[PDB]
Amino acid sequence: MLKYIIPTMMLMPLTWLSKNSMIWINTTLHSLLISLTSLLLLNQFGDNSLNFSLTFFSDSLSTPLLILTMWLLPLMLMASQHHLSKENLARKKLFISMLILLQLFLIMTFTATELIFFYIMFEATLVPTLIIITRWGNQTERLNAGLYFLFYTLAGSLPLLVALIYIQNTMGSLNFLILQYWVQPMPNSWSNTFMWLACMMAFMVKMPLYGLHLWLPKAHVEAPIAGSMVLAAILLKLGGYGMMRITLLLNPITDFMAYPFIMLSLWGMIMTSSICLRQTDLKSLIAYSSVSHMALVIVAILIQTPWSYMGATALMIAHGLTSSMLFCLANSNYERVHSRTMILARGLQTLLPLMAAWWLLASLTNLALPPSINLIGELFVVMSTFSWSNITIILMGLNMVITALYSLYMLITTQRGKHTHHINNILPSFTRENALMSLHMLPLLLLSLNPKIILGPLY
Amino acid sequence: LRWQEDPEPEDENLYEKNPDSHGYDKDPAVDVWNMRVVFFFGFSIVLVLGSTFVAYLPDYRMQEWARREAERLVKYREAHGLPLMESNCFDPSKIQLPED
């Protein structure tokens, strides 16, 4: 994995030595070369994971998140340059450097062999994200949004740090390759109970948990577009990836301690969906949709069945691409109407027809239209939760009504009906914007043809 | 007037001075070459050749092989009267149960 970290580090002299108009083109070209290079991690085996060194390995779980992460840099560089055309050249290079630095921390968060290196990179991804949110955000409430994002996560993770050192003193190592083989059944006491809480609550914060999700609708509507893309598509999936790593060590106490957080998520996926019904703020609607989808990932990791893990990883990849496309659609309104109020700009199908078709495709994949891998992930999670308890289908099926009702209302409000009279700066869609929608959605539509590369360590 | 300040600029249309603009850059040669970089290294490199690369993966996690092995091993136990699957995975002669 040192053939991916060295070019990502080489992207810093690629962006600090470039000419004043070349700093987007060079980084986009070389980052697309890195993303096409990133398909070499499909050398996975049905028994052995692809294991590189003492410091890095990459199973079939970290591999699609890696391809998504190294693919998400050129899409952020495309999405985040029209609102930064008047910005100074030095801070423009700084914004590109922070995106490259965040990619550098993410690609060796997922390939972490030993879990305290996973922790160091897992909390290292805060710093460029925090600088992006508080510096290149657009409105007044970003500075408050720099605190709620930060001091929630650390408030779970500095206990989690302690927990990992305890395993370094008890099992003898924090390698995931060792702890597949030296894992011991964790009995019932209050000591092992707080061991479970210390292992799980930081990832519950970064999933987010229903109740601990207060950072998320404020950290998405106050970030810039590249920030909202990378918080929706990857940084919520650090929690799911970390839970899939860390629930190996937590048997069988998870089989009776995870019940309240399962209840929190199975009811939060109803309540945040009903919140998505009543959002005047479009980017807030997409953020609460991200909560309402990641609640099923929390449930599928805690019930720990193979259908649930494959459905959870498919829903993480598919929701990453879907929510990134939705935030770019919110940006493609907000760069023309200059307000995130969803009830302001109606009737955009009379003005932007192909962009309205992209709104249609993202609004259909958000409600998991088959055979997209949104529906594969959603479907396998619902199947495994019917296997878990036979009443839970109600809370799934009711959710799969309301998941339609904000996916179509955002489709109906922003596109259908009478257009707005006092607005006459609705420009045509740029080639940047439609290329952005195509690079978001067409990999998600091609993964319907071959989903067996994004289905976890136990396909 | 508190905190003396520039007038707020205009939300500029790139299509006024450049109706052939793609939206990447106001200088048209750099703009159209950025379009060429995006479309070539985004579609003529990553989607098409990458989808060809993912299309012909060499048996991703042995989904072909484990079928074909099964199409031998069922043959190994349809012929000679062996059951198709035991209820035991490991050999019960080499397991030491705890006595009671």
Partner: peptide, 19 residues
């Protein structure tokens, strides 16, 4: 419509003897 940066009213919170 542009980016918000702090004004005098926001900056007078950081100017007293205490916070």
């Amino acid at each position: 419509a542009r980016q918000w940066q702090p004004d005098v009213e926001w900056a007078e919170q950081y100017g007293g003897a205490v916070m």
